[PDB]
Design an enzyme around this catalytic site. Structure first.
Site, PDB file in Angstrom:
ATOM      1  CD  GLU A 185     -57.042 -23.652  20.420  1.00  3.62           C
ATOM      2  OE1 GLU A 185     -57.324 -23.370  19.266  1.00  3.62           O
ATOM      3  OE2 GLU A 185     -56.029 -23.277  20.987  1.00  3.62           O
ATOM      4  CG  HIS A 201     -51.333 -34.311  13.201  1.00  2.00           C
ATOM      5  ND1 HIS A 201     -50.529 -34.819  14.206  1.00  2.00           N
ATOM      6  CD2 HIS A 201     -51.383 -35.197  12.154  1.00  2.00           C
ATOM      7  CE1 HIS A 201     -50.103 -36.004  13.756  1.00  2.00           C
ATOM      8  NE2 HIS A 201     -50.589 -36.275  12.532  1.00  2.00           N
ATOM      9  CG  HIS A 214     -47.200 -24.935   6.428  1.00  2.00           C
ATOM     10  ND1 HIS A 214     -46.215 -24.009   6.125  1.00  2.00           N
ATOM     11  CD2 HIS A 214     -47.814 -24.469   7.564  1.00  2.00           C
ATOM     12  CE1 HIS A 214     -46.264 -23.042   7.058  1.00  2.00           C
ATOM     13  NE2 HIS A 214     -47.222 -23.273   7.961  1.00  2.00           N
ATOM     14  N   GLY A 242     -44.647 -41.711   3.830  1.00  2.00           N
ATOM     15  CA  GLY A 242     -44.947 -42.092   5.241  1.00  2.00           C
ATOM     16  C   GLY A 242     -45.837 -41.034   5.897  1.00  2.00           C
ATOM     17  CG  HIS A 266     -44.611 -19.283   8.165  1.00  2.00           C
ATOM     18  ND1 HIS A 266     -43.869 -20.286   8.769  1.00  2.00           N
ATOM     19  CD2 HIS A 266     -45.928 -19.610   8.380  1.00  2.00           C
ATOM     20  CE1 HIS A 266     -44.736 -21.160   9.314  1.00  2.00           C
ATOM     21  NE2 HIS A 266     -46.004 -20.794   9.105  1.00  2.00           N
ATOM     22  CG  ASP A 291     -55.483 -27.903  19.643  1.00  2.00           C
ATOM     23  OD1 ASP A 291     -56.488 -28.445  20.072  1.00  2.00           O
ATOM     24  OD2 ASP A 291     -54.639 -27.379  20.351  1.00  2.00           O
ATOM     25  CG  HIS A 346     -51.266 -21.358   7.725  1.00  2.00           C
ATOM     26  ND1 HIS A 346     -50.926 -20.104   8.209  1.00  2.00           N
ATOM     27  CD2 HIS A 346     -50.085 -22.059   7.655  1.00  2.00           C
ATOM     28  CE1 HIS A 346     -49.595 -20.091   8.411  1.00  2.00           C
ATOM     29  NE2 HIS A 346     -49.034 -21.256   8.087  1.00  2.00           N
ATOM     30  CD  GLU A 347     -52.703 -27.655   9.789  1.00  2.00           C
ATOM     31  OE1 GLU A 347     -51.556 -27.640  10.204  1.00  2.00           O
ATOM     32  OE2 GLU A 347     -53.540 -28.476  10.123  1.00  2.00           O
ATOM     33  N   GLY A 399     -45.168 -38.019   6.117  1.00  2.00           N
ATOM     34  CA  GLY A 399     -44.974 -36.715   5.423  1.00  2.00           C
ATOM     35  C   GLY A 399     -46.251 -36.341   4.666  1.00  2.00           C
TER      36      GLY A 399
HETATM   37  C1  LIG Z   1     -54.257 -19.223  10.154  1.00  2.00           C
HETATM   38  O1  LIG Z   1     -52.926 -19.707  10.025  1.00  2.00           O
HETATM   39  C2  LIG Z   1     -52.328 -20.219  11.187  1.00  2.00           C
HETATM   40  C3  LIG Z   1     -52.255 -21.597  11.411  1.00  2.00           C
HETATM   41  C4  LIG Z   1     -51.661 -22.104  12.558  1.00  2.00           C
HETATM   42  C5  LIG Z   1     -51.119 -21.257  13.504  1.00  2.00           C
HETATM   43  S1  LIG Z   1     -50.236 -21.939  14.903  1.00  2.00           S
HETATM   44  O2  LIG Z   1     -50.376 -21.090  16.044  1.00  2.00           O
HETATM   45  O3  LIG Z   1     -50.508 -23.338  15.017  1.00  2.00           O
HETATM   46  N1  LIG Z   1     -48.484 -21.915  14.603  1.00  2.00           N
HETATM   47  C6  LIG Z   1     -47.854 -20.565  14.745  1.00  2.00           C
HETATM   48  C7  LIG Z   1     -46.977 -20.261  15.953  1.00  2.00           C
HETATM   49  C8  LIG Z   1     -47.502 -20.279  17.243  1.00  2.00           C
HETATM   50  C9  LIG Z   1     -46.679 -19.997  18.327  1.00  2.00           C
HETATM   51  C10 LIG Z   1     -45.344 -19.703  18.090  1.00  2.00           C
HETATM   52  N2  LIG Z   1     -44.809 -19.676  16.876  1.00  2.00           N
HETATM   53  C11 LIG Z   1     -45.619 -19.951  15.840  1.00  2.00           C
HETATM   54  C12 LIG Z   1     -48.016 -22.904  13.590  1.00  2.00           C
HETATM   55  C13 LIG Z   1     -48.243 -22.340  12.185  1.00  2.00           C
HETATM   56  O4  LIG Z   1     -47.630 -21.371  11.727  1.00  2.00           O
HETATM   57  N3  LIG Z   1     -49.153 -22.972  11.465  1.00  2.00           N
HETATM   58  O5  LIG Z   1     -49.429 -22.545  10.185  1.00  2.00           O
HETATM   59  C14 LIG Z   1     -46.644 -23.617  13.715  1.00  2.00           C
HETATM   60  C15 LIG Z   1     -45.941 -23.374  15.045  1.00  2.00           C
HETATM   61  C16 LIG Z   1     -46.730 -25.129  13.520  1.00  2.00           C
HETATM   62  C17 LIG Z   1     -51.189 -19.886  13.307  1.00  2.00           C
HETATM   63  C18 LIG Z   1     -51.788 -19.370  12.159  1.00  2.00           C
HETATM   64 CA   LIG Z   2     -53.467 -24.831  21.387  1.00  2.00          CA
HETATM   65 ZN   LIG Z   3     -50.216 -33.702  15.825  1.00  2.00          ZN
HETATM   66 ZN   LIG Z   4     -47.566 -21.926   9.499  1.00  2.00          ZN
END
Ligand SMILES: COc1ccc(S(=O)(=O)N(Cc2cccnc2)[C@@H](C(=O)NO)C(C)C)cc1
Ligand SMILES: [Ca+2]
Ligand SMILES: [Zn+2]
Ligand SMILES: [Zn+2]
Length: 157
Positions: free
Chosen positions: A95, A90, A116, A84, A122, A92, A112-113, A86
């Site tokens: 920005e 996504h 996961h 589904g 992490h 953002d 990074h995504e 999973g």
């Molecule tokens: C370059 O690698 C990165 C990718 C995404 C992010 S992220 O700010 O979106 N975020 C980290 C986060 C933000 C605020 C508070 N706690 C944790 C996501 C995260 O760790 N994504 O990997 C999480 C909250 C969904 C940061 C770094």
């Molecule tokens: Ca943001």
């Molecule tokens: Zn989303």
């Molecule tokens: Zn992460």
């Protein structure tokens, strides 16, 4: 859970007007190569049918339980590897995304995504790209902790 298949497919739903597709495809294709370059896993883009990993860009609230709150908050997220939604990822779009050491870096977040979706958690290593928060480092390269981790799950190339 983890992917029992040795080959995975991905597809971009649409490209953001901030940057063309050729530049975005390179960034997404380059990230897969970095993971494949150290793992016997293979990736392939599909223009039809469902893909194991779906990539799409969203803004503000997009029918999710974690709406973005302005430029602050999380910059991107993804769902655990499952059927589904999973495996979906996504990004953002509120920005501005760049293709170089500018303010933000799309390829870097893409790497990074993908971690996961590979089931990588992490880490607390500064040289680990799986950094908990968004931090500016230097060159984009896989760390030994990430190589040993992904290789331990599957094996060495
Ligand atoms: C370059 O690698 C990165 C990718 C995404 C992010 S992220 O700010 O979106 N975020 C980290 C986060 C933000 C605020 C508070 N706690 C944790 C996501 C995260 O760790 N994504 O990997 C999480 C909250 C969904 C940061 C770094
Ligand atoms: Ca943001
Ligand atoms: Zn989303
Ligand atoms: Zn992460």
């Amino acid at each position: 859970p983890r992917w029992e298949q040795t080959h995975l497919t991905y597809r971009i739903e649409n490209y953001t007007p901030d940057l063309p597709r050729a530049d975005v495809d390179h960034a997404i294709e380059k990230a897969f190569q970095l993971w494949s370059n150290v793992t016997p896993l293979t990736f392939t883009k599909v223009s039809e049918g469902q893909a194991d990993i779906m990539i799409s860009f969203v803004r503000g609230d997009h029918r999710d339980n974690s709406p973005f709150d302005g430029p602050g908050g999380n910059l991107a997220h993804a769902f655990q590897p499952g059927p589904g939604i999973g495996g979906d990822a996504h990004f953002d779009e509120d920005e501005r995304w760049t293709n170089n050491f500018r303010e933000y870096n799309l390829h870097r977040v893409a790497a990074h995504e993908l971690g996961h979706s590979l089931g990588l958690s992490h880490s607390t290593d500064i040289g680990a790209l799986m950094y908990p928060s968004y931090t500016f480092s230097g060159d984009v390269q896989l760390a030994q902790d990430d190589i040993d981790g992904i290789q331990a799950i599957y094996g060495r190339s």
